[PDB]
Amino acid sequence: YVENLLTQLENELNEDINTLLRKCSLNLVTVKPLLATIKRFLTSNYDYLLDVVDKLVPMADFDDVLEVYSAEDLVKALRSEIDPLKVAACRVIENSQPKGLFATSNIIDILLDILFDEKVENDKLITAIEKALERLSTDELIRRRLFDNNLPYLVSVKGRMETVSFVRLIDFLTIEFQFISGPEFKDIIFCFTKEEILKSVEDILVFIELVNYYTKFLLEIRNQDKYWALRHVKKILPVFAQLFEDTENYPDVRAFSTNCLLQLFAEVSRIEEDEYSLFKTMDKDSLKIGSEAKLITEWLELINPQYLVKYHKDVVENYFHVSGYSIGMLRNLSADEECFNAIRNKFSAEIVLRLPYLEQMQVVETLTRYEYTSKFLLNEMPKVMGSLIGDIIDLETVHYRNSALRNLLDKGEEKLSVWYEPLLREYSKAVNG
Amino acid sequence: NYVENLLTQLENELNEDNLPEDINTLLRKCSLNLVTVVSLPDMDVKPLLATIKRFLTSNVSYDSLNYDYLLDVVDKLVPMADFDDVLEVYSAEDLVKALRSEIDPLKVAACRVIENSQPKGLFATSNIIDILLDILFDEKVENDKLITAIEKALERLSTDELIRRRLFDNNLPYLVSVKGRMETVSFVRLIDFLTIEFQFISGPEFKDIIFCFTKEEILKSVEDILVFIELVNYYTKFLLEIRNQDKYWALRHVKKILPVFAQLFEDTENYPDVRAFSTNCLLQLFAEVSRIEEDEYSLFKTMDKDSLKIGSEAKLITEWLELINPQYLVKYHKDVVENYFHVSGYSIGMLRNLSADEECFNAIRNKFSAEIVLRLPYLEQMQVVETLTRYEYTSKFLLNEMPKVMGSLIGDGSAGAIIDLETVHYRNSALRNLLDKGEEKLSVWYEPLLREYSKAVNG
């Protein structure tokens, strides 16, 4: 049936065309003459035609695709003035088998010419290029073509700092960093000097994109355990903090980029190396946690809690009080034992029990996450445990209650004592009905 | 200041007698700036939303403006603004008129407004949801962006009880009528809708009539194999969601029909299209069935004995050993596990599954030797080692019986130079999983593992 529908399409393209194209697409999601007929139609609803190509290409054996779309045809397609043909070329390139097949040609180079062309407004084409590059970048030869054969070009795009092509470059580097090893890492491509960061402030959108690039860069270093990359990034982190502080000379930085800078500083505080040496200097010289009242909640919600208790114990001790409002701060401050000890005297069963059930469940779920917080809950607030067990339609309440029940049960029967059987009973009722 | 002035220039350019030449470049620039986050409280945002609305409600299409660019500004502007301001421009009656129109861009804008409803139950007392369902299940609708906009609006609002009531109570006979059509296009959208909705449904809200299919409906779906495949996939994701969301109460509503899928899989003479076109999706379903919260594999052992007959069809053996619960495999097909499995790069998929149960691992243990593993290329050795590193019983086997393999994991000092993505990933994971066991259980391997892990992550 699928082969006959494709044969019809092959005869038809050489009315209700859109409907048959949809029918072909729907059947494929759930070959040379058809691919060649579509190619002739593209070299001469186009989105519906391309969707058939997008589903047909990965399904077929790549040798058959290569016969219709040669490396030479792909260069011609990408150098044309026909956007749908360029998208089809991208789909072919994306599905290259082996992934390094086109690594010896200038195909990747041409993909980069289109990607960094600010005049390109076709979002589907930009996405198709990025998807083709992301898929192929697991291969070493493809990363070599990108970061060695096209290094001067990438550095030229980087130096330009033209809004449209720069944002696409940042997106490209973010995607590429997940595949890059220590020996492949190039500072000139992935890292920005103080001078480039100062230049980005002139166009605040570019600056915000750069702050977000660094936040995701630090997050990826933590997620992928790529600590070797820290020495390449740390030296410029105090520049972002200096810009955050310098409201007289760079008012646009606090005016338009406060939130993204706070997320960056949250990541910087997770660098513990040499007793928070870098973050301590940024805080002392620039951030000055506690000195600007309107940022106190955010600092206590975002900054490494071990850092907060060691250098701003007075802020933690005095500022934090239990309420639905301070749940964000509770989740962060509870994540370090010493930091939790600095807020522990703000709790009582009475205070927690006065909160509406959704807020009690958010507080309880947070306290169930750690050994020291759960011990405090069980030994000092058994009335709160009584409220958790109880005598619910709200999805958030059910989510936090079930997570609290599950986190306590993870501790085991021995550590739960008298709470074991009531918790098991409540969890069974919630998951089994 | 800059973003609201960019929005101000757009409001002024759109209200000029004739649209200026730069209109589409301005819209595109507005979209890139809004991408960031929340709006400036400079002005109400109401005149710009109302100006865009007049362009969308107009039956006159202007050659000079790009409607996709105009909608992209709406899709970024609506969630950024206070909903009371959006309501002033787009009332519940304007939304009904927009959805009942013949203007697709206007219907998409209506969806964005509905999606961002605050409170979520605001339009639950109107027929707005009913109209969204009429469009969603209309086969003649070819606009994929409109279909997605409806699904996104329904997904966002379905966390609310009143919205689920409008869906599953006020529109129950309609939804059941769409379900009974089993017309390809509307059916696929219905399955996607039910998958979205199941995330939010509680035990007391669950309705068998709309979420579950009887044997008769499953037999009817075979007539159009695409519909049957969509149904197999629906059940696989349904069982996966029960495991992921701990919704075990739903199993009693689904289990009774699971043997029908296995019967169809076996019956190649009377249902040849089942095996011909749906083998792979059925294998994924059976993998989930072998993992359900049930009493000693009651249901799966009957499906296997009567229909699946694991081990009787040689060409499916690798797939069964890669997919089926390993505890089930060793208890009922120990002979298959013992004879079939041998170590190679090819059998890595089987190794990862069979290693996940201790008894099952004991049945493959004698196929390992340091010599066999050491002959594999380094990427494959790392995949094998990383698998053995995942469990207490496999790691004990690796450390006590294959110290030469541990020697290969530690290596000759050239690991810092490994460029292969996959090799680094599996080696580092193996190193990390072993270190998680602690210094006491690692003995002499502790310091070399710590040294190798430090070099990999810090060097």
Swiss-Prot record, chain A:
Subcellular localization: Cytoplasm
Family stated for the protein in its record: Belongs to the proteasome subunit S5B/HSM3 family.
Protein name, entry field: DNA mismatch repair protein HSM3
Entries under InterPro entries matching the protein: ARM-type_fold, HSM3_C, HSM3_N
Gene: HSM3
Subunit structure: Interacts with RPT1, RPT2, RPT3, RPT5, RPT6, RPN1 and RPN2. Part of transient complex (BP1) containing HSM3, RPT1, RPT2 and RPT5 formed during the assembly of the 26S proteasome.
Biological process annotations from GO: mismatch repair; proteasome regulatory particle assembly
GO molecular function: protein folding chaperone
Family annotation (CDD domains): Hsm3_like
Protein role: Involved in DNA mismatch repair in slow-growing cells. Acts as a chaperone during the assembly of the 26S proteasome, specifically of the base subcomplex of the 19S regulatory complex (RC).
Further remarks about this protein from its record: Present with 468 molecules/cell in log phase SD medium.
Keyword Cytoplasm: yes
Keyword Chaperone in annotation: yes
Keywords, sorted A to Z: Chaperone, Cytoplasm, DNA damage, DNA repair
Pfam family, one: HSM3_N
Superkingdom classification of source: Eukaryota
Signal sequence residues: none
A GO term from the CC aspect: nucleus
